[PDB]
Point group: C3
Chain length 319, copies 3
């Protein structure tokens, strides 16, 4: 019997299925109260949080423990999200992000961007299809992003009319990076997301399977390789058909999560883990009820005091 840590030192990292504040209950899978911090946003994911669609909803756990239930939305990242030459693959970007949310001492901070000429700061839909901050360069220049020694991942998207990286002609679209970047002969617009910094990795999590209504993309499928991965109810890898719609509100997922979060009388303060099996979990110590011991003392006292009455009479009758 799985027991998940339901305690104020734990952050639940989720998507619409856990977004209790902002999603109609009919579409929730997390339908019990979570005593820790809830960071769950409809439509979001660890890659999607860098897209600019949800500019205020970055995941920023600061607790020792985490439980993750997300990933389905990250399968909308595809080839155009790793098309800038020298971009990380989505497989490797996702691995670093999921490891970071699970184990990491993480932050979200502004990414360095500069250039050999003054760029124009504005916002536009022309790079991604929705409004993000851009720098516009109206003549060709050197553009630099990130800093040597950095430890984290950021997303870049470009709409360039010229430019190369190390002599390789740029291709318009996006990419993920965990090192500094330099574009030469660059003209056009550039979006750079904040950096998801991942420093030390001694925090702890459970990673609950997030299923889609189609087979998972490779970069989220590979989360099965992490020691923290725990299966959740699914039908051949696909989200169950017992919900409100094909993607939300599964009765069996709800029962799985609720049961795992309502183990009775677990003293979470006494185990350094984001979960435990019920029989092995440390249990709360309770007040001792001494009423039954007191009843025995009374019943014995009764027979004794009546033994005293009897004895005296036997003593007199023997006189």
């Amino acid at each position: 019997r799985l027991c998940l840590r339901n305690y104020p030192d734990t952050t639940w990292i989720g998507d619409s299925r856990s977004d209790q504040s902002r999603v109609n209950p009919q579409s929730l899978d997390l339908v019990t109260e979570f005593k820790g911090v809830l960071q769950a946003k409809n439509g979001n994911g660890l890659l999607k949080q860098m897209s600019g669609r949800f500019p205020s909803d970055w995941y920023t756990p600061t607790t020792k423990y985490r439980i993750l239930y997300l990933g389905t939305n990250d399968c909308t990242d595809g080839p155009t999200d790793m098309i800038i030459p020298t971009s990380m693959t989505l497989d490797n970007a996702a691995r670093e992000l999921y490891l970071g949310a699970c184990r990491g001492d993480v932050r979200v901070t502004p990414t360095f961007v500069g250039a050999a000429i003054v760029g124009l700061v504005g916002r536009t839909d022309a790079v991604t299809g929705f409004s993000v901050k851009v720098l516009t360069f109206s003549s060709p220049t050197i553009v630099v992003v990130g800093l040597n020694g950095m430890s984290g991942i950021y997303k870049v998207c470009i709409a360039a009319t010229s430019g190369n990286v190390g002599g390789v002609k740029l291709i318009n679209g996006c990419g993920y990076f965990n090192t500094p970047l330099r574009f030469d002969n660059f003209q056009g617009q550039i979006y750079v997301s904040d950096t998801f910094e991942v420093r030390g990795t001694k925090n702890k999590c459970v990673l609950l399977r997030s299923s889609s209504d189609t087979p998972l993309c490779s970069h989220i499928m590979r989360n099965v390789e992490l020691d923290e991965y725990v299966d959740t109810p699914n039908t051949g890898g696909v989200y169950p058909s017992d919900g409100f719609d094909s993607l939300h509100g599964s009765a069996s997922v709800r029962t799985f999560l609720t049961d795992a979060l309502t183990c009775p009388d677990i003293d979470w303060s006494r185990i350094d883990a984001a979960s435990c099996e019920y029989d092995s979990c440390p249990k709360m110590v309770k007040d001792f009820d001494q009423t039954s011991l007191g009843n025995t003392d009374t019943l014995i006292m009764r027979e004794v005091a009546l033994h005293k009455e009897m004895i005296s009479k036997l003593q007199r009758d023997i006189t």
Copy 2:
């Protein structure tokens, strides 16, 4: 009998009356040690933190639980703080901010600002009357602030010689916003505060009344409508006259707060709440003291030994 959660997973959000680090003790109302995180600043409030007076003192709770004791300073925001056309009302801005500090998964982050031309970044007292960060646009241009999809509140203050919002001529002063903004034909100087991001809202608080020395302004008075509101000692809504001055050090407020924070032997780990009534609060389990039960045994034993003697004596006395 009110018990407030006095525990490391709780953030106390306050003003001079709770600023134990930086205010003379004679002016404090929070005069007992708080076992959680204390974020309290002389002069500050959830609106005032955006004024530019507090560039390093924004409130940033990251804990599951909060206790708020602030608002009196926010009553110095007035008509000039909601005068930019399309600004939020102070009533609505305060409501979002107090709900955010109380229940929110919150962050404080830089607000996007851009324009159709390059302006100048500097600092001046010309916009608000005191030194803040400003952008100067000496030629009329399009100025853009915030981003579609954002979830939070920021403050804008302008000193403009031209400009309009959607064709409505701008009025100099300030406003609060929770959506992106666009000014057309803008010439002059603009201050933009950081954004108080409010994402999910499943954290928990108590909101303790903060009284002024006159009746509260409308936008703070309305905090009485929140489920978390708890009255604090007052005289017809005004701060009591039993303190160091008209605004600080009330003997009766001090006793109220100290009593509520020193309920003995509450096991806060076993209740998912920022307060409880004493009789209903979960109590710490203590080692059981068996001394009285052991004394009862010894008395019984003394008597039974006597009966053993007297019985033997009867048996022999049957000589």
Copy 3:
């Protein structure tokens, strides 16, 4: 026996000797699992975090409690780190930073930089010897850093061909500042670090001595004046000679830290402190064992039952006679 708070509401703030995630185990001193949050980076310190060498590794504790085991690396700051006129001394900068990490409600945020002209944003090795963000000003201008009312410390480094502060000619190098700054007639390149904001100071820590392989520089030696300072194993003030090298992996430091973090059955939830002496620490309560009380009851009941038997024999042995 020292017991250090080993609990999820505590942040361990360290350097390579505690950087369990990223440092070879032979060079670790913290070799036991820490149940709280670990923020420890090889080569870093509370001053060095502002240098730009570790741009993603700023210390950002958000917990009520902290344990510090760092400082040796901050002795690489020297005269060139307080040479800009009006800079804080390293003694005063370190004091504010160590108090902030120990006791502070802290944040790490961007530092305001503005000017009378548009500064060119770029990155270069020319100011510090390694790559950092700089602004370049190619015309003599007014440059302003920080904001009135701020509460925190930031680092500035310059490579200027002209400029002054309040009429005092600038000197190239670095400085630490906790107030807004203004340079006049400035021309050249300027690096400005993020701000380590220190607001209220009612969080709590233990500050464990961090020893170097030579005697400590003055600005870290002075951490002994703080109430929270606790000595750690050392040989005449320098790191012991029982480690992997002269600066890491000391066998005696390891034992000191492991012993202090493995006090058995401490109920940290019942003490508002980052440490306690073992005998005084609150201990976990266990279920009460009533077996001895039950044995005493049962023994008594057996005896009283023999009395019933023998009384009846008596009560009868008399009615006969």
